[PDB]
Design an enzyme around this catalytic site. Structure first.
Site, PDB file in Angstrom:
ATOM      1  N   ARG A 132      -7.474  -1.246 -29.148  1.00 55.87           N
ATOM      2  CA  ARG A 132      -6.160  -1.627 -29.225  1.00 55.87           C
ATOM      3  C   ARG A 132      -5.433  -2.814 -28.547  1.00 55.87           C
ATOM      4  NH1 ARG A 132      -4.371   4.893 -28.288  1.00 55.87           N
ATOM      5  NH2 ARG A 132      -5.849   4.582 -26.746  1.00 55.87           N
ATOM      6  N   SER A 133      -5.646  -3.086 -27.462  1.00 54.67           N
ATOM      7  CA  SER A 133      -5.068  -4.452 -26.866  1.00 54.67           C
ATOM      8  C   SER A 133      -5.740  -5.547 -27.672  1.00 54.67           C
ATOM      9  CB  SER A 133      -5.464  -4.548 -25.478  1.00 54.67           C
ATOM     10  OG  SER A 133      -5.346  -3.359 -24.796  1.00 54.67           O
ATOM     11  N   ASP A 157      -6.348   6.496 -30.498  1.00 57.52           N
ATOM     12  CA  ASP A 157      -7.550   5.836 -29.638  1.00 57.52           C
ATOM     13  C   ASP A 157      -8.672   5.242 -30.509  1.00 57.52           C
ATOM     14  OD1 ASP A 157      -8.518   4.831 -27.315  1.00 57.52           O
ATOM     15  OD2 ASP A 157      -9.261   7.111 -26.531  1.00 57.52           O
ATOM     16  N   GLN A 159     -12.608  -2.552 -31.048  1.00 56.97           N
ATOM     17  CA  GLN A 159     -13.588  -1.571 -30.674  1.00 56.97           C
ATOM     18  C   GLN A 159     -14.290  -1.067 -32.136  1.00 56.97           C
ATOM     19  OE1 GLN A 159     -15.089   0.241 -27.713  1.00 56.97           O
ATOM     20  NE2 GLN A 159     -14.921  -2.116 -27.918  1.00 56.97           N
ATOM     21  N   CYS A 216      -4.625  -0.771 -23.131  1.00 52.52           N
ATOM     22  CA  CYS A 216      -4.458   0.622 -23.750  1.00 52.52           C
ATOM     23  C   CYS A 216      -5.184   1.452 -22.498  1.00 52.52           C
ATOM     24  CB  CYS A 216      -5.370   0.732 -25.037  1.00 52.52           C
ATOM     25  SG  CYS A 216      -6.482  -0.651 -25.108  1.00 52.52           S
TER      26      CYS A 216
HETATM   27  O1  LIG Z   1      -8.002   2.579 -24.998  1.00 52.06           O
HETATM   28  C1  LIG Z   1      -8.627   2.035 -26.274  1.00 52.06           C
HETATM   29  O2  LIG Z   1      -7.791   1.803 -27.216  1.00 52.06           O
HETATM   30  C2  LIG Z   1     -10.083   1.426 -25.875  1.00 52.06           C
HETATM   31  O3  LIG Z   1     -10.421   0.702 -26.201  1.00 52.06           O
HETATM   32  N1  LIG Z   1     -10.857   2.619 -25.687  1.00 52.06           N
HETATM   33  C3  LIG Z   1     -12.077   2.949 -24.900  1.00 52.06           C
HETATM   34  C4  LIG Z   1     -12.962   1.742 -25.140  1.00 52.06           C
HETATM   35  C5  LIG Z   1     -14.205   1.671 -24.449  1.00 52.06           C
HETATM   36  C6  LIG Z   1     -14.604   3.115 -24.003  1.00 52.06           C
HETATM   37  C7  LIG Z   1     -13.740   4.071 -23.970  1.00 52.06           C
HETATM   38  C8  LIG Z   1     -12.516   4.058 -24.537  1.00 52.06           C
HETATM   39  C9  LIG Z   1     -11.716   5.147 -24.799  1.00 52.06           C
HETATM   40  O4  LIG Z   1     -10.300   5.334 -24.669  1.00 52.06           O
HETATM   41  O5  LIG Z   1     -12.189   6.364 -24.690  1.00 52.06           O
END
Ligand SMILES: O=C(O)C(=O)Nc1ccccc1C(=O)O
Length: 297
Positions: A220-221, A180, A261, A214
């Site tokens: 990830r996506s 993640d 992200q 994800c």
């Molecule tokens: O799942 C991801 O890959 C991702 O974008 N995650 C996230 C993105 C935004 C807020 C929270 C998450 C998380 O998993 O905590």
């Protein structure tokens, strides 16, 4: 060239600033529906919503809201659906989406437990003998087989629309070693998963958009879709230097928030697309080099 820009960013360590630039330039369009009080229990994060323009609407009459967005890349001629990891209350909406949008494959870039927390429902059958039936959307779903690798598993699933008794096969591609808020173990590993996907017909236009998720449907996506679209763009032309990645990212930005992200994810995207460019530019022998390196078995 991207290789040049890479080595220039990298030299002055400016990935953070670049990434910040992106976050700052990106499109902000409304997500009115997503923020409707009746959809509270439909979104998994306060902060990750589908823009109204681009959201996918269920063909229900009750409530058409799903946290999912069609990213439609015009020039690359390739759409995907980015969604969050289905909630225990939306597992049946997720498969209705796949039914209606006519999708062939689903790419899961996450583990159902990550970092101590449950990131995603167990929305598909992990065994043979015990199907799922989603009462609320009238769909049945069965594991037909799976092909477990060291870092990923391909499942073949049968989806039936129990209202008509029509059936369809779905390939599920589960990447189980992409942390993640991280990047995959290497470009060879990522590009090896990416190409399993491609080979399989899922991202082809005789079919509806590949569903990509994800946990949130963004880091990830976005990371995945970005490499793919960049390779596809260079593919049509056989011209790498017509590809601007940060500009591509901004076209995706228009369609879903938050695509990629972190700045290491961005960085990883250049690594991925510069490496895969080998293969698009006619060295088809790299594709099995990826497979070795990858340690798929
Ligand atoms: O799942 C991801 O890959 C991702 O974008 N995650 C996230 C993105 C935004 C807020 C929270 C998450 C998380 O998993 O905590």
């Amino acid at each position: 060239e991207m290789e040049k820009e890479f080595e220039q960013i990298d030299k002055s360590g400016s990935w953070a600033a670049i990434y910040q630039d992106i976050r700052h330039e990106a499109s902000d369009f409304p997500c009115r529906v997503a923020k409707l009080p009746k959809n509270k229990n439909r979104n998994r994060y306060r902060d990750v919503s589908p823009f109204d323009h681009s959201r996918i609407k269920l063909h229900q009459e009750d409530n058409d809201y799903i946290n999912a967005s069609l990213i439609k890349m015009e020039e690359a001629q390739r759409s995907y659906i980015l969604t969050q990891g289905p909630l225990p209350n939306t597992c049946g909406h997720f498969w209705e989406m796949v039914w209606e949008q006519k999708s062939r494959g689903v790419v899961m870039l996450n583990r159902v437990m990550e970092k101590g927390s449950l990131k995603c429902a167990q929305y598909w059958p992990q065994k043979e003998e015990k199907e799922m039936i989603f009462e609320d959307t009238n769909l049945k779903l069965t594991l037909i087989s799976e092909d477990i690798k060291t870092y990923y598993t391909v499942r073949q699933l049968e989806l039936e629309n129990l209202t008509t008794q029509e059936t369809r096969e779905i390939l599920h591609f589960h990447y189980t070693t992409w942390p993640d808020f991280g990047v995959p173990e290497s470009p060879a590993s990522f590009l090896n998963f990416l190409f399993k996907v491609r080979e399989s017909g899922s991202l082809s236009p005789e079919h509806g958009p590949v569903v990509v998720h994800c946990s949130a449907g963004i880091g990830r996506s976005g990371t995945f879709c970005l490499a793919d679209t960049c390779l596809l763009l260079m593919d049509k032309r056989k011209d790498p230097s017509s590809v601007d990645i940060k500009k591509v990212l901004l076209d995706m930005r228009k369609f879903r928030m938050g695509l990629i992200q972190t700045a290491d994810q961005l960085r990883f995207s250049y690594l991925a697309v510069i490496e895969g460019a080998k293969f698009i530019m006619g060295d088809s022998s790299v594709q099995d080099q990826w497979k070795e390196l990858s340690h798929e078995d």
